[PDB]
Design a protein around this ligand. Sequence first.
Ligand code: OLC
Lengths: 83, 82
Amino acid sequence: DLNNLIGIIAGAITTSALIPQALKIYKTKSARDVSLAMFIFMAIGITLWFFYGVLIKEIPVILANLISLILIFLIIFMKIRYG
Amino acid sequence: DLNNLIGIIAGAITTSALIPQALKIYKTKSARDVSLAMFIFMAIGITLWFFYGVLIKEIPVILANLISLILIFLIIFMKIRY
Ligand SMILES: CCCCCCCC/C=C\CCCCCCCC(=O)OC[C@H](O)CO
C-alpha cells in the first residue's frame, strides 16, 4: 500500500523529530529558550489530529499522533522541571 | 463534513502552535535550548505528510502541512540568526 507506506514514513519522522528536543533539554537540564506555548497547543492540536485519524480511518495519522503526544508530554514535563 | 471540521480545527491549532516559538526567539533574541535537529527533521516529515495528504486526498492534511513548512523554515531561520 503506497499511501500507508508514505504515511508511516512521514509519521515515523515527525514523531521521532521530538526526540532530539527532548534529549537536548535532558542533557543540558535547561529549556529557557524553548517555547512552552508551542508545545501546549501542539498537544491539543495533536489530540484533535488523532480524532481526525480515527474518523477517516487512517492508521498512520492515529499512530503518529498518539506517540507524538507522549513525547510532547515529556518535553512539557522537563520544561516545567528545569524551569 | 464532520471530518473536515476536526481536520481543519486540528490543522489550525497545530499550524498556529509553531508561531510562538518563532516569536519567542525573536523577542528574547536567543535560541540556545531550541533543537535545530528537531525542526530539520520536522520539515522533512511534514513535507512527507503533504505528499500523503495529496495521495489520500485530504485537503486539511495538504493545506495544514504546507503552511507549517513555511513556519518551520521561519523558525529555522531565527534559530540560526540567534
Ligand atoms: C498555501 C500556504 C502558503 C501561505 C503561508 C502563509 C503563512 C506564513 C506566515 C508568516 C511567514 C512568512 C514570513 C516571511 C519571511 C520572513 C523572513 C524574513 O523576512 O527575513 C528578513 C530578512 O531575511 C533578514 O533581514
